[PDB]
Amino acid sequence: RKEQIVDCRAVMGLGEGGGLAQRGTFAEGLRNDVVVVAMSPGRRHITKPVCEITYGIREAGIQTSVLVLDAGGGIPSDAPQGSLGSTFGLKPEEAKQVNRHKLCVIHFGNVKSHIIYKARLFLKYVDIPTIIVCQTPVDMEDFAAIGIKTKNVMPLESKTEGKIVEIITGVIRGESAPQKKIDEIIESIKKHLG
Amino acid sequence: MNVLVNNNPKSGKTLEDVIKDEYYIPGSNIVIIKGTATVIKEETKKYLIKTTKGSFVVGITEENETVDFWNKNYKSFEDKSLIWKSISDVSFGSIEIPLPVSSVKQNFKKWDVVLSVSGLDTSEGNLIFVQRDVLELYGLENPKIGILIGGKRVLKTLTADDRIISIEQMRESKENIDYEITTNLNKEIQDTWKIYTYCKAEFDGPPQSTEHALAILENGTLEISENTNTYVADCRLQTLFIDEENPEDRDRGTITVRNIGNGVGKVYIYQESRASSLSHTVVGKVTDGIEIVDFSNSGHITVKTNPERLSVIGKTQKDAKILFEKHGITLKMEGNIDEDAIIVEQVPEYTMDILKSKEVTTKGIEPEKLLYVEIYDKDAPTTSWYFRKVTGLTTKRIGTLKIYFKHDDISMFERDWDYSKGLLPENTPEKSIDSGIIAVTNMVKKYKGYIGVRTSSNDKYGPTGETFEGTNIVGKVVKNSEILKSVKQGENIYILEVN
Amino acid sequence: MYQIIRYEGGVYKNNILKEWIEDVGGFIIQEHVMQLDVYMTIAIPQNEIENFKEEAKKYKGKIVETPLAGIEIAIVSPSLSRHHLPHIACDVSEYVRKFGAKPNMIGLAHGAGKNISEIREKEKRLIQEHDIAIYVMGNFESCILDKTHLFKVDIPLVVTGGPETLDIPYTYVGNLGRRAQRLRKGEEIRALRQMIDEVTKKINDKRMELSYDPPIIPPVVLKDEIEKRIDEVRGILAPMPIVTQLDGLRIKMDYDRNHEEIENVKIGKYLLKDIAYVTRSEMKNYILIKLKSTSE
Numbered sequence: 001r002k003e004q005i006v007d008c009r010a011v012m013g014l015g016e017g018g019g020l021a022q023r024g025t026f027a028e029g030l031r032n033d034v035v036v037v038a039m040s041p042g043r044r045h046i047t048k049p050v051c052e053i054t055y056g057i058r059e060a061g062i063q064t065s066v067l068v069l070d071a072g073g074g075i076p077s078d079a080p081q082g083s084l085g086s087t088f089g090l091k092p093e094e095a096k097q098v099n100r101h102k103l104c105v106i107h108f109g110n111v112k113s114h115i116i117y118k119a120r121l122f123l124k125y126v127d128i129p130t131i132i133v134c135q136t137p138v139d140m141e142d143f144a145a146i147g148i149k150t151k152n153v154m155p156l157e158s159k160t161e162g163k164i165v166e167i168i169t170g171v172i173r174g175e176s177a178p179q180k181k182i183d184e185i186i187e188s189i190k191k192h193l194g
Numbered sequence: 195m196n197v198l199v200n201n202n203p204k205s206g207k208t209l210e211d212v213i214k215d216e217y218y219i220p221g222s223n224i225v226i227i228k229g230t231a232t233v234i235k236e237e238t239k240k241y242l243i244k245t246t247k248g249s250f251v252v253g254i255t256e257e258n259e260t261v262d263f264w265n266k267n268y269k270s271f272e273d274k275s276l277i278w279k280s281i282s283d284v285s286f287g288s289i290e291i292p293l294p295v296s297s298v299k300q301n302f303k304k305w306d307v308v309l310s311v312s313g314l315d316t317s318e319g320n321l322i323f324v325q326r327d328v329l330e331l332y333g334l335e336n337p338k339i340g341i342l343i344g345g346k347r348v349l350k351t352l353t354a355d356d357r358i359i360s361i362e363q364m365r366e367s368k369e370n371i372d373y374e375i376t377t378n379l380n381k382e383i384q385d386t387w388k389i390y391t392y393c394k395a396e397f398d399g400p401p402q403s404t405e406h407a408l409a410i411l412e413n414g415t416l417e418i419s420e421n422t423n424t425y426v427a428d429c430r431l432q433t434l435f436i437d438e439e440n441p442e443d444r445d446r447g448t449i450t451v452r453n454i455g456n457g458v459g460k461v462y463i464y465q466e467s468r469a470s471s472l473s474h475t476v477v478g479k480v481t482d483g484i485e486i487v488d489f490s491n492s493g494h495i496t497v498k499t500n501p502e503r504l505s506v507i508g509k510t511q512k513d514a515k516i517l518f519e520k521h522g523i524t525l526k527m528e529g530n531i532d533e534d535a536i537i538v539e540q541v542p543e544y545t546m547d548i549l550k551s552k553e554v555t556t557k558g559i560e561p562e563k564l565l566y567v568e569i570y571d572k573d574a575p576t577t578s579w580y581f582r583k584v585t586g587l588t589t590k591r592i593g594t595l596k597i598y599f600k601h602d603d604i605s606m607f608e609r610d611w612d613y614s615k616g617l618l619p620e621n622t623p624e625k626s627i628d629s630g631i632i633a634v635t636n637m638v639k640k641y642k643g644y645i646g647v648r649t650s651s652n653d654k655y656g657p658t659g660e661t662f663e664g665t666n667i668v669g670k671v672v673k674n675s676e677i678l679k680s681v682k683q684g685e686n687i688y689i690l691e692v693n
Numbered sequence: 694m695y696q697i698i699r700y701e702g703g704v705y706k707n708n709i710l711k712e713w714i715e716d717v718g719g720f721i722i723q724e725h726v727m728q729l730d731v732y733m734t735i736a737i738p739q740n741e742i743e744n745f746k747e748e749a750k751k752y753k754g755k756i757v758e759t760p761l762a763g764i765e766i767a768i769v770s771p772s773l774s775r776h777h778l779p780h781i782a783c784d785v786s787e788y789v790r791k792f793g794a795k796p797n798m799i800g801l802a803h804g805a806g807k808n809i810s811e812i813r814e815k816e817k818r819l820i821q822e823h824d825i826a827i828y829v830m831g832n833f834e835s836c837i838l839d840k841t842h843l844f845k846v847d848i849p850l851v852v853t854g855g856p857e858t859l860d861i862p863y864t865y866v867g868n869l870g871r872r873a874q875r876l877r878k879g880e881e882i883r884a885l886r887q888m889i890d891e892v893t894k895k896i897n898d899k900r901m902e903l904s905y906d907p908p909i910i911p912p913v914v915l916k917d918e919i920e921k922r923i924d925e926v927r928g929i930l931a932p933m934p935i936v937t938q939l940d941g942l943r944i945k946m947d948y949d950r951n952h953e954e955i956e957n958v959k960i961g962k963y964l965l966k967d968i969a970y971v972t973r974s975e976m977k978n979y980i981l982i983k984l985k986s987t988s989e
Contacts (some may be wrong), residue, residue, distance in 0.1 A: 003816050004773045005976060006798035007945075010933045011725045011732060012790040017877050020787045023727055028931055030977045047875075051779045058773040058800075097930045240905065251905060255898050301862055329862055341898060344905045423740040424717050441921070443961075444718070455712045466738070468718035469914050472921065 019046045024070030026097045029063040035101040039072030044174040056182035076121040095125035104130035123162035131166045140167045165192045210379040216391035222494035225486045228372035236366030244360035247352040251344020252307045260309040260339035275357040283325040291319020299330030307340035323349040373489040392496040397478035400438040401544035403451045407477040408503040409589045421491045424466040434459040440475045444468040447480035504545045508591030511535045530558030566673035567689045574620040577668045584610040593689045606646035614643030623662040626653035630671040633657045639664035697762040700733040702754030720917045736913045762793025767823035771804030784876040788885045819975040824939040830854040832870030849895040908984040944980040948973040
């Protein structure tokens with residue numbers, strides 16, 4: 001039980017009856033322990049799967065920061081045969097804001113082939129241990145098949161400087177996350193933070 | 195009749211008469227000022243006072259209706275002694291306050307002007323200058339009229355004996371300046387009318403930016419291309435680069451040159467005291483006669499620069515000699531020494547450098563070595579502008595072309611990869627190109643911006659080795675020739691526009 | 694003299710408008726580009742309001758009048774848990790952001806409960822470091838009435854609560870309690886507008902009180918001077934690296950490594966240490982600046 005102060009963003013949200021967060025914005029929780037990364041300020045990512053994880057971390061006693069990615073939708077351009085639909089990417093300032101935290105929690109989606117290259121590009125610039133929160137069951141070996149550092153399944157040629165420390169499956173975008181998933185996230189953060 | 199002119203009064207009814215003496219390049223504007231109005235407006239949302247214990251500054255905040263009362267009834271509260279200074283704060287009056295004294299009590303804050311009708315008796319309405327945050331204590335719809343902050347101690351020290359005497363306000367005052375802008379001369383003057391003719395510019399800054407500003411004001415007139423409430427700008431040289439930072443305050447009548455962005459090279463004159471900017475290079479100041487800039491919104495203003503521009507490139511050698519000896523500058527000769535030798539280069543070429551060093555090295559050229567060119571400005575405006583920028587004719591009277599590549603009949607000149615942006619195909623040949631034609635390759639070809647000329651004629655290729663669709667004709671060499679065949683690669687030839 | 698507004702236009706030819714703002718002496722306080730539109734909080738002189746409006750309508754931009762874009766607000770939620778954080782508190786914070794203010798979420802350590810509630814002195818001083826504080830309380834009359842000691846600061850105060858009318862000796866805005874939904878109904882929007890009106894009135898009164906005895910230098914041009922002199926201000930990863938307060942600034946650097954650089958800044962012909970109170974901030978060991986007036 002201690003005081004928890006958040007440096008709020010400087011930009012207003014999406015209109016009047018819309019989301020409260022804005023794309024490409026960072027909200028510092030003073031003391032930098034856990035940063036929660038959201039792909040977009042839309043209803044698929046904000047307050048249904050992300051702010052719930054955020055309040056679970058804040059209820060566990062760990063100060064939390066929420067960063068909304070500027071371009072979090074789609075696949076990176078280094079995916080096979082280029083990108084389609086939209087291009088996923090990370091800004092250097094976003095990577096610097098993530099890298100000052102002890103741990104990262106990132107929320108991914110459905111398709112297995114999208115998540116692996118998204119995590120590879122994210123960990124090409126992020127060097128802290130991150131927890132991947134997705135919906136479909138991805139095994140923590142398919143990331144090593146494309147060269148991602150990983151606690152249990154290392155690659156021979158590691159193309160990332162950050163390590164996936166836990167995969168948590170069963171969190172749907174735009175839906176209320178149950179207490180059991182929050183408890184798994186809290187236990188993983190406590191076991192891999194101190 | 196007897197009117198005041200500048201600082202030395204004249205009388206001549208018609209402007210011409212008084213402006214005859216006043217130095218003025220014809221074409222500029224005339225600023226007349228009439229006088230001052232001195233309108234006194236005071237609303238005193240914050241009210242003053244003149245008590246027998248000093249003067250505090252009240253300030254209406256809560257409109258309610260106590261404000262509506264105070265509005266004019268504070269004058270009825272004038273010369274009213276302090277009624278009580280008890281736990282119910284300091285109170286004054288007490289005058290008639292018809293405000294419906296609603297029993298409903300209200301909360302008030304420390305030092306909040308309150309007109310609580312004391313005892314709920316209209317005529318006993320007390321001016322309770324609140325001292326401590328009193329909660330539900332006074333009746334009335336809402337005694338809170340304003341908040342006391344200024345002179346807090348005055349109302350604290352104020353004792354029963356002391357009255358508010360002259361309840362002051364704020365004597366709010368304003369000023370208006372009459373201006374009319376003119377450019378007639380045959381008009382009648384009534385009496386005591388002031389006329390300003392020109393402004394004086396003092397230059398002190400980095401040499402390149404100051405030279406840019408001097409080139410802008412070489413003719414003594416400053417065009418007004420943009421006008422705001424804070425500055426006026428000139429856009430004669432808006433695509434010329436400078437790399438000099440002089441980031442100090444843009445005070446009243448400051449002359450700056452924008453050194454970066456879309457408007458790099460614009461010359462600003464500031465009519466308001468503003469903060470320093472990294473994108474503005476101050477080149478000097480306007481010493482006296484700011485009002486001509488202040489009241490001019492468009493047109494021309496006659497500007498006199500205190501340091502004369504010491505750049506003699508279009509003159510003869512004796513003119514440079516006499517002009518530099520009249521400034522007391524030591525001189526030495528370099529190239530052609532003839533009294534009529536045309537100067538081509540001077541070291542240093544900047545007025546500030548010359549003045550700080552007190553010596554000039556002047557280089558002349560042979561009469562037959564100078565190349566004479568004619569530039570098509572109406573035919574190819576963008577290409578001619580690019581050619582003037584690259585060769586330097588925008589600033590001096592003699593431009594320099596550097597030989598880049600040479601082969602028999604062809605001689606190609608160097609390009610500037612900073613001005614060759616909008617080189618759309620402008621003046622493309624239709625028939626075979628004749629000899630002695632200067633041309634620039636447009637953006638169609640890979641080597642865009644390269645200038646060249648050939649001494650022969652062909653029906654297929656332009657003066658730069660490109661086809662006709664990739665070449666726009668900018669000008670031609672008119673008089674001097676047979677020097678393009680005897681100039682090596684890397685050597686500079688000098689040109690003079692003859693229109 | 695420096696009216697602060699928000700510009701909402703496109704990124705196309707936005708640099709030319711920024712050059713015009715710099716030419717007329719304006720300062721860009723905040724810039725954010727989402728995809729193709731840019732939100733720009735600009736402080737321009739009051740004599741250029743109509744010229745900037747004509748310039749903005751040339752680029753099909755929008756001028757939004759923001760009455761709170763010179764202050765910072767502390768929003769004091771009792772905790773950062775699921776009860777108060779993910780709704781109401783962000784709704785209040787984003788509505789405050791919509792009118793230009795820079796908010797900070799203050800989660801109390803022991804702000805929950807009816808009789809077990811307490812407020813620490815460190816949290817107290819962090820609240821006093823802001824210009825105005827907004828308390829987001831619950832929806833029971835007796836609970837908040839037995840919780841007055843939380844609102845004990847010498848700062849302007851607006852208390853938001855569930856009951857329509859409360860008998861506390863502070864400014865109170867009703868119909869904003871603890872909820873679990875996004876504030877979107879008409880009564881909720883009306884109550885948010887009411888809270889905005891009360892904080893606007895308090896900020897205007899404090900602005901008049903400051904205008905009775907003006908400071909030596911306005912905070913906006915002081916922030917501009919600090920960004921011009923200090924070159925480490927562009928390396929700050931915080932949301933707002935320099936927060937413009939009502940009578941000062943909050944520079945988000947380490948106090949121990951940067952206070953001697955901040956104090957030895959020459960503005961005009963004055964040093965900053967003789968004209969401002971450079972002190973350590975309770976918020977993440979930052980630098981807090983409090984301006985002196987012309988009386989001293």
